[PDB]
From a paper:
(a) Ribbon representation of PC39-17A with 11aa CDRH1 insertion. HC CDRs are colored (CDRH1 in yellow, CDRH2 in orange, CDRH3 in red) and the 11aa insertion in CDRH1 shown in blue. Structures of all three 11aa-insertion Fabs reveal an extended CDRH1 that provides support to and stabilizes the long 22aa CDRH3 (Kabat numbering) of the lineage. The similarity in backbone conformation (root-mean-square deviation (RMSD) = 0.3Å) and neutralization potency (0.10 vs. 0.09 respectively) of mAbs 17A and 50I suggests that the preconfigured interface in these structures is conserved across 33 months of Ab maturation. However, neutralization breadth was shown to increase during this time highlighting the importance of continued SHM. When compared to other V3-glycan bnAb Fab structures, 11aa-insertion mAb HCs (17A, 23D and 50I) most closely resemble PGT135, which also has an insertion in CDRH1, while the LCs of these mAbs are more similar to that of PCDN-38B, with an RMSD of 0.48 Å (S12(A) Fig). Most mAbs were sensitive to D325 and R327 mutations, yet only those with the 11aa CDRH1 insertion were sensitive to mutation at every position in the 324GDIR327 motif (S4(A) Fig). This difference extended to gp120 binding, with 11aa insertion variants displaying a higher affinity for gp120s as measured by SPR and an absolute dependence on N332 (S4(B) Fig).
In this study, we investigated a donor who developed a family of potent HIV bnAbs with different lengths of an insertion in a critical framework region following infection with two founder viruses that were closely related and underwent extensive recombination. The bnAb lineage is defined by a CDRH3 length of 22 amino acids (aa), an IGHV4–34*01/IGHJ6*02 heavy chain (HC) and an IGKV3–20*01/IGKJ2*01 light chain (LC) gene. A greatly reduced ability for donor plasma to neutralize N332A Env-mutated pseudoviruses of different clades identified the V3-glycan bnAb site as the major target for PC39 neutralization breadth. Ab crystal structures show an extended CDRH1 that can help stabilize the CDRH3.
Numbering used by the authors:
A (entry chain L): 0 to 27, 27A, 28 to 95, 95A, 96 to 213
B (entry chain H): 1 to 31, 31A, 31B, 31C, 31D, 31E, 31F, 31G, ...
The structure:
């Protein structure tokens, strides 16, 4: 028995200038003295926003406010600014240990759908001398974040031999970029001809394939 | 200016003991006078970690009285100590595994029910944070990266593959920082080999591929590895 926090939604997508409503629910009723909120941006420590009966911490502007009673608590950002897009955590602090955080809500910028530009890169001759082949597929400047990448090697669908990495939302155009890297040995790589990256994204009418033929 | 200096070894091997320390500056842990604001007995010196892909996990806290509170998920392993004469408090975690790879933050917790004159904002929260110690638990040896070109093919895209390095991080720039527009440096991934890998890409006009020079600058501080790699059409 302990106080468990659940935040909702997992991700919130809003435009600058809109009002954001973030929710945090405690498993038991808790005094509003002990409901704290934090902002967390990539590459930085979390920062306290609201605590002790919805009082703003030092340096926190007026558009951040808190409300709630019993089990359901709310962080409100009355008018979003570009710097307000980040991850937000609630925390129970002082009612009963452990003083655990909620799962956090990612507040991202909502923009119109943007299709990715797709590029495929063969392994360089230099890497092949190292005994390994990496094939890189680039999905550039797309929205929303959800995308599917399917590697095909001489029309054989691959699974479990590639890794993905996604950038943070771009501060200028609010898009995402994704890379998928297929890793094969030199010996395996030279057994096949056509290396293809198939991309599915809601901004694309049909899946888009980029490919090369090994050696050309 | 209360601030927290984070130190301690961040590169560990499995089964070893993590040992981190934060030094408090701008205030004294051994000052038992109280004439203004919040009593220094109302501070709770705390540890919070974030593993990759997870949220914040409150580890525990210690008061200058020596009383501790620990998260039940780690209570069987964790130890938190305080040394007021050195303005230090520390975190110890033995028998570490890859599940302990995380950024570890120390922070000042505040829980005041009385005060003198004024109560500064930040009560009942962690109002001051250290900027973290990245900790990696791995049997891998410190290794500089291998940098391979992602050559432009037949708006063009090109880049560099910064592969097989340990530990994190690496800094990547283009043309010594003269090229920033259109650059995407992806977050590294941990490969199944235990080494990290990332790519850095940039979109450029196709017409510039004959004239413009494209060089990616990679700096891996833990191995003192600096690589300038030229990327040109193949």
């Amino acid at each position: 028995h302990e106080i468990v926090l659940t935040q909702s939604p997992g991700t919130l997508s809003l435009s600058p200038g809109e009002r954001a409503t973030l929710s945090c629910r405690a498993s038991q009723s808790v005094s509003s003295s002990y409901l704290a909120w934090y902002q967390h941006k990539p590459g930085q420590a979390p920062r306290l926003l609201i605590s002790d009966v919805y009082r703003r911490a030092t340096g926190i502007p007026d558009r951040f406010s808190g409300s709630g009673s019993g089990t359901d608590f709310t962080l409100t950002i009355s008018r979003l600014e570009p710097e307000d897009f980040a991850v937000y955590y609630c925390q129970q602090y002082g009612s009963s240990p452990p003083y655990t955080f909620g799962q956090g809500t990612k507040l991202e910028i909502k923009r119109t759908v943007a299709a990715p530009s797709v590029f495929i890169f063969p392994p360089s001759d230099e890497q092949l001398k190292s005994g390994t082949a990496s094939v890189v597929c680039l999905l550039n400047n797309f929205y929303p974040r959800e995308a599917k990448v399917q590697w095909k090697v001489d029309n054989a669908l691959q699974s479990g031999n590639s890794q993905e990495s996604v950038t943070e939302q771009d501060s200028k155009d609010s898009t995402y970029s994704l890379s998928s890297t297929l890793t094969l040995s030199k010996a395996d790589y030279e057994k096949h001809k056509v290396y293809a990256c198939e991309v599915t994204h809601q901004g694309l009418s049909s899946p888009v394939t980029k490919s090369f033929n090994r050696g050309e | 200016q209360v601030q927290l200096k984070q130190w301690g070894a961040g590169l560990l091997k499995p089964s070893e003991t993590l040992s981190l320390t934060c030094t408090v500056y701008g205030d004294s842990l051994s000052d038992y006078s109280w004439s203004w604001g919040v009593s220094r007995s109302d501070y709770y010196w705390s540890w919070i970690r974030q593993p990759p892909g997870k949220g914040l996990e409150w580890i525990g806290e210690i008061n200058r009285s020596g009383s501790t509170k620990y998260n039940p998920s780690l209570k069987s392993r964790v130890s938190i100590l305080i040394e007021a004469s050195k303005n230090q408090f520390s975190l110890k975690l033995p028998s570490v595994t890859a599940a302990d790879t995380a950024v570890y933050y120390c922070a000042r917790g505040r829980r005041s029910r009385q005060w003198i004159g004024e109560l500064p904002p930040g009560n009942y929260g962690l109002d001051v944070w250290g900027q973290g110690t990245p900790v990696s638990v791995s049997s891998a040896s410190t290794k500089g990266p291998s940098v391979f070109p992602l050559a432009p093919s037949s708006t063009a895209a090109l880049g560099c593959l910064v592969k097989d390095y340990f530990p994190e991080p690496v800094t990547v720039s283009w043309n010594s920082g003269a090229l920033t527009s259109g650059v995407h440096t992806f977050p590294a991934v941990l490969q199944s080999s235990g080494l990290y890998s990332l790519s850095s890409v940039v979109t450029v006009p196709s017409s510039s591929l004959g004239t413009q020079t494209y060089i990616c600058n990679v700096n891996h501080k833990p191995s003192n590895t600096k690589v300038d790699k030229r990327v040109e059409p193949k």
